[PDB]
Amino acid sequence: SGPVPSRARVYTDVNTHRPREYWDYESHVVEWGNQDDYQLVRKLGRGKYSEVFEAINITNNEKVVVKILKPVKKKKIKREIKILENLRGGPNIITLADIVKDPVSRTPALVFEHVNNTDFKQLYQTLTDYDIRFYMYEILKALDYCHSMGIMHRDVKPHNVMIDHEHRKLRLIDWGLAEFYHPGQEYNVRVASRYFKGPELLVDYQMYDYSLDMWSLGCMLASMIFRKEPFFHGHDNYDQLVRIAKVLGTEDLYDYIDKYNIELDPRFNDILGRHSRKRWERFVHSENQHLVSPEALDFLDKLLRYDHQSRLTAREAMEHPYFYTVVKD
Ligand SMILES: COc1ccc(/N=C/c2c(O)ccc3c2oc2cc(Cl)c(O)c(Cl)c23)cc1
Numbered sequence: 001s002g003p004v005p006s007r008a009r010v011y012t013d014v015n016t017h018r019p020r021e022y023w024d025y026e027s028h029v030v031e032w033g034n035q036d037d038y039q040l041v042r043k044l045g046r047g048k049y050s051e052v053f054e055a056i057n058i059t060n061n062e063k064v065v066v067k068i069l070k071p072v073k074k075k076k077i078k079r080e081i082k083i084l085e086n087l088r089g090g091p092n093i094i095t096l097a098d099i100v101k102d103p104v105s106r107t108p109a110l111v112f113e114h115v116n117n118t119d120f121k122q123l124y125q126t127l128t129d130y131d132i133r134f135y136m137y138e139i140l141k142a143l144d145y146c147h148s149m150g151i152m153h154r155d156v157k158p159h160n161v162m163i164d165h166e167h168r169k170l171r172l173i174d175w176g177l178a179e180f181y182h183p184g185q186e187y188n189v190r191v192a193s194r195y196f197k198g199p200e201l202l203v204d205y206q207m208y209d210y211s212l213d214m215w216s217l218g219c220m221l222a223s224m225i226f227r228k229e230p231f232f233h234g235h236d237n238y239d240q241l242v243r244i245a246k247v248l249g250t251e252d253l254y255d256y257i258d259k260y261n262i263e264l265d266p267r268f269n270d271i272l273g274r275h276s277r278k279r280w281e282r283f284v285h286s287e288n289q290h291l292v293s294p295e296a297l298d299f300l301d302k303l304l305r306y307d308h309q310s311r312l313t314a315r316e317a318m319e320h321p322y323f324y325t326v327v328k329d
Contacts, residue, residue, distance in 0.1 A: 004260045007183045008209035010313050014150040015180055023150065023180040025082035026075055030108065035100035038066055038111060048072070049176050054114070063114040064097060069107045076176065077108055083151055083178045084110070090149070091141035094162070094171045115171050120158035123165060124224055129291050132224045133326050135163065135170055137318065139217060142172040144314035147210040153178050154191040156216035158223075181209055192216060194240055195230035199253070199306045202241040203262050211308040214317070218303030225296050227288040242271055248306060249277030256306035295322040 015023045041054045044065070055066040069077050084096040098111035127135070139161060146153060153160075155177040162171045177191050186206035192198070198215035200208045222231035232247070234240025245253050250272060257264060264272075280297045299322040302312045312320070 003205060003207070003262055005184060006205075006207045006209070006260065006309065008181060008211065009309060010315070011147050011150060011181070011210065012183050014148070015182055018150070022086065023182075025079045025180075028078050028082045030078075030081060030099055033098040033100045033111070035103060035109065037098070038064060038100065038109075040066060049076070055111075065112045065114055067110040067112065068102045068105055069110065071105065071107045080176050080178065081108065081110070083175050083180075087146055087149060087151065087175075090145040092138050092170050092172055093142055093145060094173045094175075112173075113171075115162040115169065116164040116166065117162040118165055120161070120163075121229070123163060124158065124229060125227075126165075127224060129293070130325070132221075132291060133323055134168070135161075136217075136221060136224075137323050137326050137328070138170040139172065139220075140314050140318050142170075143210075143213050143217065144318065146172075146178070147181075147213070147314055150181050151178055152181055152210045153213050155193065155196075156213050156220070157193050157196045158220060158229075159193075161220075194234055194237060195219060195232055197237070197240060198308060199241065199244060199256065200308050202237060202244075203257055203264060205260060205262055208308060211311045211313070214303055214311045214314065215308070217317075218300060218311075221296075221300050221303065222283075225288065225291040225300070226283045227291065228283070238265070238267060238271065241268070242273070245272060246275050247278050248304065250275045252277065252306050259307065293322075295320070295324075298322070 021027060037057055037059055038055045039058050041056060044052045044054055049070050049072055051068045053066045053068070055064050056062065057064050081099065087093045088096055095113045096110060097113055100109050100111065102109040143153065153172065153175065155174055160172065160174045162173050179187060184207065187208060189201040189204055189206060192201065196216040196219045198212045200212065219231055223229040232240060232243045234243045280300065284292050299320045305311050
């Protein structure tokens with residue numbers, strides 16, 4: 001009775017071999033800077049958990065980004081800080097430069113390196129086939145790094161990938177939903193943005209792992225090579241799974257939930273239907289064919305699999321022939 005357990009197939013026990021303080025973020029003691037070192041310039045955005053500003057370090061005229069955390073969840077605050085410090089210096093991980101106490105909100109304000117980002121809505125319309133492969137490889141470097149450090153991002157999406165296209169620089173940002181992977185642990189399924197939620201989240205399977213990020217990455221790849229953003233455009237979390245099933249088919253979906261002894265929410269009875277798997281060539285047309293190759297479709301197919309245990313890992317993905325044409329380092 002109940003779901004079948006699952007474990008990551010890589011980096012499974014990295015945290016249990018760590019000192020407790022590495023992953024015990026509740027015990028972390030924050031070292032504070034001087035908030036008056038930074039002057040806010042303009043607000044860049046606001047979400048449920050933070051407000052983000054362009055700012056200047058007034059001690060050396062340096063551009064920085066300041067993320068003022070909202071006082072909603074406090075252990076979520078220590079979690080993000082500890083993860084950012086643990087991952088600092090890793091390939092294409094945003095660098096946390098300082099932590100100050102904002103005088104107005106009385107909450108932590110995170111100071112990050114600045115990236116000359118262009119909005120993905122404008123940038124993805126300009127990317128060549130080579131650019132897509134290049135930036136995909138850069139994202140994979142960041143994902144393999146954090147996974148190898150025992151951390152899943154859980155909010156991979158174009159909005160959380162800052163790209164300075166003039167300088168071909170990429171940073172993975174917003175670690176507010178990131179979590180330490182502990183084998184056998186049941187996690188909250190209310191993570192990631194709707195269009196990038198893995199099937200495991202949508203069927204309410206809690207014992208997921210780093211492979212969630214690889215589904216989200218596959219969703220990004222599909223939107224880039226097919227020029228369709230987002231690729232799976234659900235109107236809610238239930239319709240999101242139906243949209244996936246209209247592409248991947250319902251037979252493999254039922255095989256997936258049967259393998260883990262998962263029972264679908266009965267509200268899917270009236271909306272899921274019966275769908276064959278579609279060949280990826282259905283989504284190729286004159287406006288995206290220059291972005292599609294046999295290698296791209298083979299890669300995408302190995303990311304967008306219902307069974308989280310069957311997806312390519314970040315390291316395996318970097319070995320894929322899709323990246324043979326990319327000059328590295
Ligand atoms: C011209 O319009 C723009 C130019 C740059 C621009 N840069 C945002 C930016 C950054 O350069 C580094 C880190 C973050 C940024 O936004 C974030 C949000 C969250 Cl939530 C977060 O955790 C992090 Cl680390 C960052 C945003 C708009």
